[PDB]
Design a protein around this ligand. Structure first.
Ligand SMILES: [Fe+3]
Length: 212
């Protein structure tokens, strides 16, 4: 953990922890214990970059768990729409069209819209407050996530179904960010500007799906 963490203002620490808990939802992650088995199972089936992705996701969890040893994320309540998103992912893993369902809910919406916004805020904020190890860790996750999203594009075959999925799930994504208003605004961000960015990201991911 960075040695200047506690000299960071409290509202800034609270906001960073709130956003970090979206990547590492320590207060409620036992709810979705089953995702470990399901993700391993599916990755062993596809057996390409999917196995590297699952390892990378574990590495991301480990980064947050190690960083926040001394200021744990168990204090953070996740919003209701976030809980819905991940309940849905468990269903998707168990579904018939699991490859396309996961690729849209997780790679496109979760990694390619929500995480993109959360990581932007974490990067910018940790830079501003000179949290150097944290910032480098977020830059590493950003790099990884770019490959995660590219991989997800490769899992999509039915372009029309995937676009419609993105469109259907986007409003849930928006609700997650709006639900975080009180924790995010103290970091100096406009919720409207963040939702505007989300709309542009949605369009970009859809464009890439249609261009494959
Ligand atoms: Fe990822």
């Amino acid at each position: 953990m960075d040695k200047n963490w506690f000299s960071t203002p409290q509202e800034i620490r609270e906001g960073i922890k709130y956003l970090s808990a979206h990547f590492y939802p320590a207060s409620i992650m036992d709810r979705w214990k089953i995702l470990k088995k399901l993700s391993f199972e599916k990755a062993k089936i596809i057996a390409n970059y999917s196995l590297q992705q699952v390892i990378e996701e574990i590495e991301h969890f480990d980064f947050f768990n190690e960083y926040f040893k001394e200021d744990p994320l168990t204090t953070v309540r996740l919003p209701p729409s976030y809980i819905k998103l991940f309940d849905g992912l468990v269903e998707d893993f168990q579904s018939s069209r699991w490859r396309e369902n996961i690729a849209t809910r997780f790679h496109m919406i979760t990694e390619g819209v929500l995480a993109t916004v959360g990581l932007k805020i974490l990067n910018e904020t940790s830079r501003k407050y000179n949290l150097l190890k944290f910032n480098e860790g977020i830059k590493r996750i950003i790099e990884d996530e770019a490959r995660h999203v590219s991989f997800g594009l490769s899992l999509i075959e039915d372009k029309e179904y995937a676009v419609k999925r993105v469109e259907e799930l986007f409003p849930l994504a928006v609700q997650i960010v709006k639900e975080g208003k009180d924790k995010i605004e103290p970091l100096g961000y406009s919720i409207q500007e963040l939702v505007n960015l989300m709309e542009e990201l949605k369009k970009a991911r859809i464009n890439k799906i249609l261009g494959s």
